[PDB]
Structure 1
């Protein structure tokens, strides 16, 4: 069930899933519709779902990782697609081998240096590239 702010923007949550507290390497996942593209794992908040809970749930489903939830980075609008996304830091402590989207749609995941994550997000996902700007 998709949820919306009062202005009709889709409510989303995502995590910057870092390999370590150094925040040098981040986990991206393949696009479901376009598997040759990389995106930040995240997705729609459910009714009455806290954004931090939605963020952790979505990165479990999409990326097959768990870890220590860190700070809210910010709230990022996508004016073109009418999304409003809460973005959190997650320090990955668990990497699971056969996760929901790997089983269901063969979703891929890969570690990127921050600079390279920004590079591969820029063309299709410039708002997700901006998640890293701070």
Structure 2
């Protein structure tokens, strides 16, 4: 069930899934519709679901990782697609071999240096590139 803010923006949560507390390498996943493109894992908040809980759930489903939830980075809008995403830091401590989206849609995952994550997100996902600005 999709959920919405009072202005009709779809509510989403996502994590920047870092390898370590150094925050030098981040895990991106393939686009579901265009698997040659990379995205930051994330998705819709469920009814009454805390954003931090949604963020951790979506990372598990899409990227097959678990770890230590860190700070809220910020709340980011995509004006064209009308969605508003809470973005958290997650320090990955568990990498699972088989995960929901690998089994169901063959979703891929890959580690990127921050500068390279920004580069591959810029063309189709410039708001997700902007998650790393600070």
TM-score (norm 1): 1.00
Q: CA deviation at 1:126?
A: 0.3
Q: CA deviation at 1:73?
A: 0.2
SS of match in other structure, 1:131? helix
Q: Distance in 1 between matches of 2:24 and 2:80?
A: 30
Which stretches of structure 1, 4 residues or more, deviate above 3 A after TM superposition? none
Q: Distance in 1 between matches of 2:34 and 2:47?
A: 28
Tell me the matched-pair count.
134
Q: Deviations over 1:27-73 (max 9, x none)?
A: 00000000000000000000000000000000000000000000000
Q: CA deviation at 1:23?
A: 0.2
Q: Distance in 1 between matches of 2:33 and 2:78?
A: 19
Q: Distance in 1 between matches of 2:79 and 2:99?
A: 31
Q: Distance in 1 between matches of 2:20 and 2:48?
A: 31
Unaligned runs of 5+ in 2: none
Q: Distance in 2 between matches of 1:109 and 1:51?
A: 23
The aligned counterpart of 2:32 is 32
Q: CA RMSD in A?
A: 0.2
Unaligned runs of 5+ in 1: none
Q: CA deviation at 1:16?
A: 0.1
Q: Distance in 2 between matches of 1:96 and 1:20?
A: 17
